[PDB]
């Protein structure tokens, strides 16, 4: 519902009672029309429909004028992937998503494909822009259809764009003067958009100061904090939801039940196959479909929860176990039907060892929920089945004692092969 606000906050849009409200203390009027989907996780969806809009009327009844030259805008956003057959429109058609104009002066936020654009228009109408563009040729993108944090700061000399707390862009704007900023704010997709186009946003805020990088980084962490884990897209991780599994230490690797052994072999993700020169990605919807079950008033997965990691093997739900007696530093996990046996552990404690914001989680096998003894962490290990030839190997879905010490190190090793993320089907990702 916000992060850090040291008297510089002048607009603070937050969810309240199936509505959005300005909690800044300036009492702006907010009108959410019917085409806007809201939820109590403070996310709102702008669509292509005419009634999908928000009008914020800022408070003109106050004597105090809060913004002169210095001001900042912050929000989280989730931008759906290009449609593979619609790359040309994606690349060329720019659309406004937030517009604040009064007397041919103000600001706007717009999107053109994989680019998000901040535009300033001073009181004379003179215009400057700054943008952040993310790669659409990554095997695995940090940005495409995943929640990320934008902060835009403005002073006399510079317009800056921070992404997830880090400075990414900077435009000199000495040649424009101040912008008249008290106008209506219209959240609405405006441009030559596909009928299918949409955008999700969250925690929209305006500040009457230029936020320091220090401040933005703090706000990033505070607004990232949750007691629950997240999936790959950054939404709350859920029980009873079908998920593909991603490994942050092995981005292009996915798990498949071996055809003649009750173990999970690791294979390489297939990639974009249709020869457009503008795009590349690795496929996400592959490997076994996993599902998380509660071991036991909502379906949200929280840190330190005890779980069963299951997956679907044709039309049966199977389970991931560890054989109780393994002497080696790591061992292949046992994938089999749901079953009780005193020769196998089946209880996993889901973990979050990283102290910085992340969508990765870790999976800890323990004897019993009760015991303090730690068996190992689920991760990928390598097996040289011929000679030790570094380029000829077989990777496997394993439990590992080695990761137990490795997760202790600070700062957290983001790239450990015991870092997992869960990917549900999402309408913002087609392949």
């Amino acid at each position: 519902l916000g992060s850090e606000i040291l008297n510089n906050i002048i607009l603070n849009l937050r969810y309240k009672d199936n509505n959005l409200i300005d909690l800044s203390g300036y009492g702006a009027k907010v009108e959410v029309y019917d085409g806007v989907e809201l939820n109590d996780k403070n996310q709102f969806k702008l669509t292509s429909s005419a009634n999908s809009k928000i009008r914020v009327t800022q408070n003109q009844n106050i004597i105090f004028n809060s913004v002169f030259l210095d001001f900042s805008v912050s929000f989280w956003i989730r931008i759906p992937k290009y449609k593979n057959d619609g790359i040309q429109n994606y690349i060329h058609n720019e659309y406004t998503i937030i517009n604040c104009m009064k007397n041919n002066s103000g600001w706007k936020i717009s999107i053109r494909g994989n680019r998000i654009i901040w535009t300033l228009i001073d009181i004379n109408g003179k215009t400057k822009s700054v943008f952040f563009e993310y790669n659409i040729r990554e095997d695995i993108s940090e940005y495409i259809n995943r929640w990320f944090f934008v902060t835009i700061t403005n002073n006399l000399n510079n317009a800056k764009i921070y992404i997830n707390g880090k400075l990414e862009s900077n435009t000199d704007i000495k040649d424009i003067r101040e912008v008249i900023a008290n106008g209506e704010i219209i959240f609405k997709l405006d441009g030559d958009i596909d009928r299918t186009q949409f955008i999700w946003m969250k925690y929209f805020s305006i500040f009457n100061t230029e936020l320091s990088q220090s401040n933005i980084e703090e706000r990033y962490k505070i607004q990232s904090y949750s007691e629950y884990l997240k999936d790959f897209w950054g939404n709350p991780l859920m029980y009873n939801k079908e998920y593909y599994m991603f490994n942050a230490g092995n981005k292009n690797s996915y798990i498949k039940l071996k055809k003649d052994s009750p173990v999970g072999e690791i294979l390489t993700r297939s990639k974009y196959n249709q020869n457009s020169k503008y795009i590349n990605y690795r496929d996400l919807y592959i490997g076994e479909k996993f599902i998380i079950r509660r071991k036991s008033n909502d379906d949200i997965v929280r840190k330190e929860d005890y779980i069963y990691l299951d997956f679907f093997n044709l039309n049966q739900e199977w389970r991931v176990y560890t054989y109780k007696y393994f002497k080696k530093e790591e061992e292949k996990l046992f994938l089999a039907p749901i079953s009780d046996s005193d020769e196998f552990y089946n209880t996993i404690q889901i973990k979050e060892y990283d102290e910085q914001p992340t969508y990765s989680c870790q999976l800890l096998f323990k004897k019993d929920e009760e015991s303090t003894d730690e068996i190992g962490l689920i991760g990928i290990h390598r097996f040289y089945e011929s000679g030790i030839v570094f380029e000829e190997y077989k990777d496997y879905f394993c439990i590992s004692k080695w990761y137990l010490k490795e997760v202790k190190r600070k700062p957290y090793n983001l790239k450990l092969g015991c870092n997992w993320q869960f990917i549900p089907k999402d309408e913002g990702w087609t392949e």
Epitope: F390, Y393, N413, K415, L416
Partner: nanobody
Framework: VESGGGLVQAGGSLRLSCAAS??????????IGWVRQAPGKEREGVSC????????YYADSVKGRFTISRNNAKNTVYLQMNNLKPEDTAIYYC??????????????????WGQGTQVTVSS
């Protein structure tokens, strides 16, 4: 940047070094490894060492002949190659990768590469 390469009679010795303060400016935890490529062949991982605890790994093809080490203070990495054979002839690259698992990175998993140093073994 690698150095130390050159022409060596069989089976003599050679010590490669790499200033690996580059290749590692992005990584808090990493493997530094040596990958070589012979003129008609695919890249061949030969050895690596972890920034973590100095664990070392070797390909069977160089076992008992190669030793990898690290100065730490100068952040320099060394490869001692003993009893070289003509099969060892190649360009040798020093590379760095994230510390993902308890095993040496495959050649495609290395993220930052030096320019390589030529090593030739004759007879």
């Amino acid at each position: 940047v690698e150095s130390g390469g050159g022409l060596v009679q069989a089976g003599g010795s050679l010590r490669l070094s790499c200033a690996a303060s580059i290749l590692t400016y992005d990584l808090d935890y990493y493997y530094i490894g040596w990958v070589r490529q012979a003129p008609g062949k695919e890249r061949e991982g030969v050895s690596c060492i972890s920034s973590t605890d100095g664990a070392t790994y070797y390909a069977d093809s160089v076992k008992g002949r190669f030793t990898i080490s690290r100065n730490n203070a100068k952040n320099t990495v060394y490869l001692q190659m003993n009893n070289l054979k003509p099969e060892d002839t190649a360009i040798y690259y020093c590379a760095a990768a994230p510390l993902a698992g308890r095993y040496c990175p495959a050649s495609h998993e290395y993220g930052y590469w030096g320019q390589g140093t030529q090593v030739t073994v004759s007879s």
